[PDB]
Design a protein around this ligand. Sequence first.
Ligand SMILES: OC[C@H]1O[C@H](O[C@H]2[C@H](O)[C@@H](O)[C@@H](O)O[C@@H]2CO)[C@H](O)[C@@H](O)[C@@H]1O
Length: 395
Amino acid sequence: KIEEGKLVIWINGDKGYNGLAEVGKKFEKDTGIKVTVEHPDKLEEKFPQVAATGDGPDIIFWAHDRFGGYAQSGLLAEITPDKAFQDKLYPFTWDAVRYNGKLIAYPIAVEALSLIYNKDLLPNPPKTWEEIPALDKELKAKGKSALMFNLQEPYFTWPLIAADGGYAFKYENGKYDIKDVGVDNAGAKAGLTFLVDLIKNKHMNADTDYSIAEAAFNKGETAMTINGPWAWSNIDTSKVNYGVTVLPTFKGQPSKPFVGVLSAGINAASPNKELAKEFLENYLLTDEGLEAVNKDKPLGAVALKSYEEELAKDPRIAATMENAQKGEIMPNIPQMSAFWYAVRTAVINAASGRQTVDEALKDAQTNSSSKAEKTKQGVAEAAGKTKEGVLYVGS
Ligand SMILES: OC[C@H]1O[C@H](O[C@H]2[C@H](O)[C@@H](O)[C@@H](O)O[C@@H]2CO)[C@H](O)[C@@H](O)[C@@H]1O
């Protein structure tokens, strides 16, 4: 079971887990309650499997889009912040963590992708996706490339898919309609086709992942990348002279990144819900707590009004918020896991040439709109049926 009287926290390995551990250590010094921060791989897939049995961490950090599914499954606790606490965070961030009328996590920070570029290689970054091939040809003549970003997670390609009309779920008459999906409309197809054409024409490689893109950009080998605020820390260390700015347009339309609110959910099986509330409200969601995490890896535009008033002065946060305004806050509905798996499969398959864009996105539409020792006992029932009446075992 989960251990009473301590806290275990999971957070993704791209975030400021060392800074979060500093907050945990302060909490322990003050209250005697040990706090252990972990960053497992694939935590967003591990959590629902282990929480189903009452195991897992006390607190899970992820963007809010996964949390409605966890809540529907009974894996996240309703939280109980009072009115004065709620007043400390922006109303729109509370909206992101509301599911079936209930608050099911504490919002931490607003994440949007931006275009990150090397000012020495590219003092003037491209306004449009369309001009990137010509820019790549120029840079290749100098032993560089124009653009590298993670092609294994559809989060990074979504802004281009959505630019000219792609969408996840239609919102109408007060709700998201899971039978009205926008992953295979003309705009979505156009965006993915453009990415695939970049690859076919050798301006990008289908196998490029988070680490490959980050290494290339930070080594000064590629002029641009697409990433979130957490990435800025390593670029600071790299000493690349970088800027953070608005994503390129496609067909003249803004790229529309899906915006995530990094949020802290409490395991519904935790015996430490009160401890988790104290930690999150009175240690983490304070200027000093968020600063500790932010100094490790930038959070983005934080949900905490007092600290955001400081971070807002950062032009990189200004760029983050411009991209956020052009994009959309993700739904939190349970169907989001199906949507993301479907689009992940489509992007990887189209990029690698395993499927055409039309084939891949048709499949994504179908799966996106398809609604998302018990074993020992079932085997036993089936065995018992073979022994009913005068039936016998064995010949
Ligand atoms: O690629 C699909 C993936 O997108 C989002 O995950 C982001 C996450 O929001 C960020 O915090 C950061 O970790 O990068 C991830 C992309 O690799 C969704 O939140 C996630 O549910 C979805 O599977």
